[PDB]
Amino acid sequence: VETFAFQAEIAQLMSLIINTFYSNKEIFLRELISNSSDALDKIRYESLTDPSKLDSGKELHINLIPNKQDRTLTIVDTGIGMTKADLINNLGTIAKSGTKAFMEALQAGADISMIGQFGVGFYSAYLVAEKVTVITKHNDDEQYAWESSAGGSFTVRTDTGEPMGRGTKVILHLKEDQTEYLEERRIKEIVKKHSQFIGYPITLFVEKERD
Numbered sequence: 001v002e003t004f005a006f007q008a009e010i011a012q013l014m015s016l017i018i019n020t021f022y023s024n025k026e027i028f029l030r031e032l033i034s035n036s037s038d039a040l041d042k043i044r045y046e047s048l049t050d051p052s053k054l055d056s057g058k059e060l061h062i063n064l065i066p067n068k069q070d071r072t073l074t075i076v077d078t079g080i081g082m083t084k085a086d087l088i089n090n091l092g093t094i095a096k097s098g099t100k101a102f103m104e105a106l107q108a109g110a111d112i113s114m115i116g117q118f119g120v121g122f123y124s125a126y127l128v129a130e131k132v133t134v135i136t137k138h139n140d141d142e143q144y145a146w147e148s149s150a151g152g153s154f155t156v157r158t159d160t161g162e163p164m165g166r167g168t169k170v171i172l173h174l175k176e177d178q179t180e181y182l183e184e185r186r187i188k189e190i191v192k193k194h195s196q197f198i199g200y201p202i203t204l205f206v207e208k209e210r211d
């Protein structure tokens with residue numbers, strides 16, 4: 001297991017998200033679905049000139065899986081996935097140019113929904129989750145698990161769980177006061193409100209394709 005420090009301003013942002021009250025937390029799901037859709041675009045376009053990139057799975061889609069027993073909400077996609085370098089670089093150690101400006105915007109009264117436009121949308125997960133685990137598999141790399149409960153660091157380790165063909169699984173360990181995001185009707189209303197025009201199928205467990 002390898003431990004990494006979040007870049008200083010990313011750590012500051014995560015603390016701000018965790019310790020300051022914001023309404024409109026529901027946009028976390030929009031941000032994660034957008035990341036899945038971006039990842040699905042990437043593998044789709046790559047496959048146009050190299051169809052073998054889909055040997056690890058041809059279906060391009062997103063699954064939403066609430067688990068009330070475990071208090072988790074999982075967002076799974078069959079997008080391009082992340083290499084180990086991708087996880088380390090893109091999910092915490094490299095500075096984002098918009099982080100400081102976003103925190104200044106929040107202090108001035110901006111809605112938390114603006115988080116994606118500032119280039120730090122992933123961290124919206126911490127509005128509702130005490131811990132986030134990201135399991136990911138990219139072609140020509142092994143499967144990895146990234147994990148953080150905030151506090152300034154994350155870990156990365158080779159994953160020996162259920163093999164994915166290709167893509168990313170974001171597992172949100174929800175805070176005790178945010179279990180509304182495990183409810184069927186709640187998930188449907190948020191998807192309808194915020195993710196209506198995503199260009200890949202979205203399926204809610206346990207069985208239902210959302211249109």
Ligand SMILES: Nc1ncnc2c1ncn2[C@@H]1O[C@H](COP(=O)(O)OP(=O)(O)OP(O)(O)=S)[C@@H](O)[C@H]1O
Nearest residue numbers: 035036039079081090116117119120121122123168
């Ligand atoms: N499901 C995923 N599959 C592959 N890569 C991902 C996934 N989720 C996040 N990432 C990576 O994490 C990076 C950071 O995600 P975000 O913080 O949402 O920022 P961003 O999506 O690059 O910027 P936007 O368009 O303003 S939300 C992405 O650019 C991807 O490289």
Ligand SMILES: [Mg+2]
Nearest residue numbers: 034035121122
């Ligand atoms: Mg994003």
